[PDB]
Amino acid sequence: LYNLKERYAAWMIYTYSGLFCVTVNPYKWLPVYNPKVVLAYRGKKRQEAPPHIFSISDNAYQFMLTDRENQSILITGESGAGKTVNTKRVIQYFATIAASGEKKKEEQSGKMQGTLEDQIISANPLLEAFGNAKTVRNDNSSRFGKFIRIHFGATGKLASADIETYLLEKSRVTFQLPAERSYHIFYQIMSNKKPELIDMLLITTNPYDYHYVSEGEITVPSIDDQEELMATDSAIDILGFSADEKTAIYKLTGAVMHYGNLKFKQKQREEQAEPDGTEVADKAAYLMGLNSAELLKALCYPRVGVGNEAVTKGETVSEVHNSVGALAKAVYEKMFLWMVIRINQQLDTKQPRQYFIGVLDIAGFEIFDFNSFEQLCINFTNEKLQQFFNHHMFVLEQEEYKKEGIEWEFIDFGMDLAACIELIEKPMGIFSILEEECMFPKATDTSFKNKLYDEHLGKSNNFQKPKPAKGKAEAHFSLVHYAGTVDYNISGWLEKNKDPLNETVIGLYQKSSVKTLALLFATYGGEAEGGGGKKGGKKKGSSFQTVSALFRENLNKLMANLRSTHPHFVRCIIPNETKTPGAMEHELVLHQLRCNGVLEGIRICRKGFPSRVLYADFKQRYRVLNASAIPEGQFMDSKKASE
Amino acid sequence: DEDETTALVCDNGSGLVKAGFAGDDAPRAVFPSIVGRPRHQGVMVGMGQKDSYVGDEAQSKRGILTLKYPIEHGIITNWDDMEKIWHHTFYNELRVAPEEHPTLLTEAPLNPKANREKMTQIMFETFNVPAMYVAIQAVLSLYASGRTTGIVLDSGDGVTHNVPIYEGYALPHAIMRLDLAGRDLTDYLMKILTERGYSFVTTAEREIVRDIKEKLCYVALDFENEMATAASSSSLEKSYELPDGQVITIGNERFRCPETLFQPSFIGMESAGIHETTYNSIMKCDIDIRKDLYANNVMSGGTTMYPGIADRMQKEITALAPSTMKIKIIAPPERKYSVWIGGSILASLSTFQQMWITKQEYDEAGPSIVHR
């Protein structure tokens, strides 16, 4: 704690802790990202230069060409740690130090749509408008995870990229805490820099007209919604999107606002929902390439298919408002997914690819007094990532003792975590019990709960019944993750995990005049064959059976990509909740350290032979001791030297 | 996805096989449960000598083959001929290779322990599937209607059953089987329609009596004053046009056929009927669970599709049940595939993965493993 702290009060944000590259939020500006530095760190082992991210980032590259292996960089930290910033910054780094489109390099609309190095870059600012928002911690917080594959060529020059998105905060779209706000886009658009848009979408410039997006805050001083709107705009173009699509995006993003304005009322003497007007529906309908009526019907009189037919079901006021919200979110998401794909599509070149460098940006194990479903998914991700490291280290360590000739035997450090992982991902584990019950037409959260216990309680060690008191809000089940005990609340899971959507409506989308909208829904339309009658399995036709069924699939496809990689680690840190440069709350940093892996890397180090010096890092600092004979050694063989 | 896409669901019936991928909404494959064996030596033009025929090619070519039904009354009676229907299902109908697909199969209500072990022996040892699972049919039907306690009246082509289920466990001692179903029902219509002064003489006349039964048959409520209605001769009559012009009329018999399900006496059966049997199952169960079963009479099976079956059953058991009780007859529209859909749901489910019997379990525990 103390080392970090001291070199921070001195304004040094980069300090290493083994393999890690700790990074602390300056909260102010620094000449570090300096265009001089970039070069400086170019072609240098981390022992030839001071702690910095470009060190990691260059070495990767090096290593990439030297060993002929693919690489990775894992950036991770809490909401306010400032990872995007790094991630982005790493990315620029790659683009710079190994570009050369030759023709694209000239000062003629440089970096505009029409080159990648730019596309690559331009990517961000689009995603950010849609997947970023003002959090109470950050002003531009990443509300989703991501993985880019920079596909380097044979020579060593840029060839392709690849994005993938994980866990998007769908809730912002409909909600927002009091000090927060929704995605930027909304506020961007209503900013009025492109007035047509306002009339085009049929909205106003006052957000308080759109409940969905003004539950929290509307304006942020550090952000210029007007400037961004263009940034965004321009990015779309560069990204190669069709105007139409670029039109769908917009039009589609406004429909969603409108939905939240959709109002209903109880039919008299009936408990049914009946439309409270065709003012808004009209707009939503038009904007989506729909028919007002058909739309309001489907919404109100959802026509289902229980048995072997299609049974028309009536809904309540409360049921509608909620379904609407479900589509709003559903639509936004999908779209977001699409955009990514489309991006990827442009980022696809024909040129050969020999290796890639993966840059992973996701959240780290965060513990809250309230841990719900989303927490499990993330924690699980991290507990995996951790084991991923612990192993790499075990492998790594063991090489030294082999190189040197020491006689040290030890078991994989990952192993310690396998217990927790199996409990989650294995067959009779949490997810399964979670995803099975989702098949029971009449199951309860409570039901699920019991199934969870009857099977794991008393029989499983990592499994425990909660500690209901302290800063926690209710009881259901705790798990014993590497970072500690997490108290999980199971309420909504079943639902959240089912992704219930009014299929009648989706129908309409599926046959929209707005192709794009139509597209986004296709994959739902193609699995319906499979879940034709009441009860059963959605997967028969390609429909998701679990909220969690993919997450896993994606998380596997990932951790696999992570393996055929030479892992490079970066841990981002957040000094003080109060936003003050040169300061640090203790216990706050302490926390991160445990959940980071930093404290676990120190542990494993200390088992034993604590301090472990990297050879160059060893030369430089100590050559001077027998100056003649130690310098010769270090220079003559980077390793043999220290020897 | 490995197996999210990959789980197969095969529902083996007395008349039809229903098959497809867990995930889908309805069976990808539906076909007769026959295996035809050619009575003479010879060939079709362009084909080779075929030793055997299955499903629709056995039905279509029935005049030169001896047709055989592997499943008598829901139970597999011939294992040589069943392995033939499975082979056809995987390789020709779904066109998948079985050795990379988990397979959820179904069995009947009081299916002998030894059979559940034998189809496991054949699934793992002759088809080499990665993993499999056998669900009980009424239990998948219930579950496909969302719930876990209820009583299923299940009725298909060779058997009818009542399977009371409580929090998922089908109750062995309360299950009733009535061997009169849609097969019996097509042959009775046949006679009341020849008896109306007709002739189903060629095989193109025989087959379509079954399509008359499906399209035009009804279960009237107050079957009493429906015969009475028949006589005053209302516009209750219904004429069907045959393969050719020969417009046949069916007024009345239209409902005399499903009245067989409430009155087995119409066909020289001395057994009790569907509604009484629903009830008797119920007064054979624990006392405290009888309000549950009564409010959850789930219907499944091709023969329970006759319109107005539910209303007749509704009133049939209200009037036998103590008035303090709530009666509730659930009959969904997709009911001819309830069983299958319940399997599709269950097998595509997030929590089912840990009940799949894997070749690891089998090679190590013997057929006993899946038998439970």
Add this chain to the structure above:
Amino acid sequence: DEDETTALVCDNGSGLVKAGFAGDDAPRAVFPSIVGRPRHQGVMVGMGQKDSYVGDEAQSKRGILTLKYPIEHGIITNWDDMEKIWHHTFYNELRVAPEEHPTLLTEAPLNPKANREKMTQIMFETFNVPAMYVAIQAVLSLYASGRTTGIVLDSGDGVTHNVPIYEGYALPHAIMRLDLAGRDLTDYLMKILTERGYSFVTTAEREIVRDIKEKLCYVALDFENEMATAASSSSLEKSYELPDGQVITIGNERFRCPETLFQPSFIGMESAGIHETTYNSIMKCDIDIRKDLYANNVMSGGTTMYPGIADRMQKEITALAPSTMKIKIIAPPERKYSVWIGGSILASLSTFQQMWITKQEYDEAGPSIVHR
């Protein structure tokens, strides 16, 4: 407040546990005193494997578990299963952590010295409560009716007792125990009601005979010319509607059931009855204290709630007691919780603080300390 809020009162019975916070007017938690152990391996949907069930989940799921009663006739007979009911009480029912709450418990009339030491051993050593205290049940009932000398007829689910108390000290040699209570009484009604020509066949028929006993049963005064009245057949009859319509009628038996408490001969018991036993307790006590006991017959317990119990007892002992005596049968309305309420009062009291056995007393004196 530290413990003003914080004192717990747990009354352990043969049929029910009554629990809650000292201060409250009535028990926060009331539930059966059972511990169910599953007869088979399996799960409920969404739950894990459960080794054990307690209270109402054991009653509701009784068909798949072997039910066991830890307290036989008011005495704790199985200590593994009792620690299970306590655990359930603190952690699930009252949802408190026990290690910061003083706990007032109750025991039975001639509870073996060794038991009072054992539940103290388990309270302090496995639940780690700060302090605890064991009150005798009749003694809390008396005190909850304001007084300190009287005789309590206490009658619940497995035992009946008479505990003469003088200025707070229950009189060991005058206490009488009669093992016939509300449990015995529900099973006798059962037979006189099947004997009325009925059937409590399913478990939903069994359970409700007990709700008939509670709602419709009476203790008639002059039970003699009440049978005589039954015969002339007045509008004395009373029909109850079952879980369903099945309106059952109970005219007469309605009071033949509590006449069992005065005549044990109705059930093949040779012991004396409630009123004689009240009396015998009394002619076993000192002479000078007998006018006090007679004017203070306090009743407590679920089975003493039958209307007209007090009038019958009033006249039952007047006519056995010397005429120079004043008889007085106090039967309060909250009597099914007298015991508990007496504990709530006492433990929330200003002067009780100095009788709490603290872990300091225990870790220093051994279980002997609280045993007195």
